[PDB]
């Protein structure tokens, strides 16, 4: 194809493309409010953590770091947050 709008690409094209090769680069990661059932409180965790985030005063382990995204513990309500 000759005629393609490189200025107005539909958002499925940009979500497909590598994060650096979009028309303006943006992170694939996000922040999410994760709370364990026992406690009352919501602690901010990064998607691709790479540290073992703990609930206050060493209550329990909250997320496990892996190659890509972090494994959140089984029995934890996570709400990814937007700005």
């Amino acid at each position: 194809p000759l005629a393609k709008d490189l200025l107005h690409p539909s958002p499925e094209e940009e979500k497909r493309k590598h994060k650096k090769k979009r028309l303006v680069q943006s992170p694939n990661s996000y922040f999410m409010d994760v709370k364990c059932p026992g406690c009352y409180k919501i602690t901010t965790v990064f998607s691709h953590a790479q540290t073992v985030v703990l609930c206050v005063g060493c209550s329990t382990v909250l997320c496990q770091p892996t190659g890509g995204k972090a494994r959140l513990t089984e029995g934890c309500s996570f709400r990814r947050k937007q700005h």
Binding site: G57, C58, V61, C63, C76
Partner: protein
């Protein structure tokens, strides 16, 4: 073996492989067990085991990677022992031992933000243990003997929410959390526990000071409930006075008079408030409201029972007291409900409640 310099830097590299994908999970408690059994000196074994002893029983809840599953009889047992070795050393040495200066070492944990909530890290183990036990009861065949074999551990759980209750060096005002955890193992307790230590005629049967220390725990509700009423109505959060008073109402029932109880229900105004509340309390309300008319029935009021127990039994969802019932509508939410299902022994019986709406009418 040296100057707590080779036990604060081997306790700072075995609680560092915690949660990690190559955890080991099992033989990490062994290396936290082989920094106390090869700790045989003062302030190197017989002083500061406390900081290790927090992370020897915290290492036993992490053995299970899931929080929907229960500790095995083996794991459950050893963590009822290791919570008590904590209390062998924190009773007969009255002081704080994750800070609050005495000499120099191995106490004095000031550099670490607050040596007070790492100190308040014992109430959150006996609270985590209080909730951990409930899963042991939720995953047993309740018509099997294996239910009774597990309810024999209820004399051992009620003990530690009492041994770490008397302990008043909080750091009234901030202790009320262990008060609710204590009263929660007293609110559904029956007549012959609460009566047949008052009812053994108080003469030369029960009138010595510590023979009348089995007479502590009939009305433990009188003392500890008002403390979770008029410190908590002064303090920040809500949960431990809504829950506190319904345990009180339910315990002014089935072994005490109606008039004493029904007043408390109308004082707090939970007839027209428990709508914006969370479900975990919204069932304790239903449990209370049902026991009201059941104990009104017990004394004689056989039409006051009727007009109160209508809106509960009217529904096909009369399992707002117990293990939930039938057909589909969002399965993922119905797995957020099997972790709500209240414990079998506590349950108001249903062939007993249908026999008060065809016996009052």
């Amino acid at each position: 073996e040296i100057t707590h310099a080779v036990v604060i830097k081997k306790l700072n590299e075995i609680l560092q492989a915690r949660g990690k994908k190559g955890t080991d999970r099992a033989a990490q408690i062994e290396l936290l067990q082989l920094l106390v059994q090869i700790a045989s000196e003062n302030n190197l074994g017989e002083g500061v085991i406390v900081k290790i002893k927090f992370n020897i029983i915290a290492s036993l809840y992490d053995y299970n990677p899931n929080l929907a599953t229960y500790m095995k009889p083996e794991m459950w047992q050893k963590c009822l022992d290791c919570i008590n070795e904590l209390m062998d050393i924190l009773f007969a040495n009255p002081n704080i031992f994750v800070g609050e200066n005495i000499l120099e070492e191995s106490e004095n944990l000031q550099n670490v933000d607050q040596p007070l909530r790492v100190r308040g890290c014992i109430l959150t183990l006996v609270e985590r243990m209080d909730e951990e036990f409930t899963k042991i009861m939720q995953n047993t065949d309740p018509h099997s003997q294996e239910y009774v074999e597990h309810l024999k551990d209820e004399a051992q759980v009620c003990a530690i929410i009492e041994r770490v209750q008397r302990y008043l060096e909080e750091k009234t005002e901030e202790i009320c959390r262990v008060y609710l955890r204590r009263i929660l193992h007293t609110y559904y307790k029956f007549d012959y526990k609460a009566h047949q230590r008052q009812l053994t005629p108080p003469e030369g049967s029960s009138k010595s000071e510590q023979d009348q220390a089995e007479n502590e725990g009939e009305d433990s509700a009188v003392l500890m409930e008002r403390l979770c009423k008029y410190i908590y109505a002064k303090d920040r959060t809500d949960r431990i006075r809504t829950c506190a008073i319904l345990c009180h109402i339910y315990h002014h029932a089935l072994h005490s008079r109606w008039y004493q109880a029904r007043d408390l229900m109308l004082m707090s105004h939970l007839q027209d408030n428990i709508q914006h509340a969370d479900p975990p309390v919204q069932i304790l309300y239903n449990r209370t409201m049902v026991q009201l008319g059941i104990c009104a029935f017990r004394q004689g009021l056989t039409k006051d029972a009727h007009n109160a127990l209508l809106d509960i039994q009217s529904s096909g969802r009369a399992k707002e007291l117990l293990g939930q019932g039938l057909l589909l509508r969002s399965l993922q939410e119905r797995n957020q409900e099997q972790e709500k299902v209240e414990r079998r022994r506590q349950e108001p019986f249903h062939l007993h409640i249908n026999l008060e709406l065809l016996e009052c009418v």
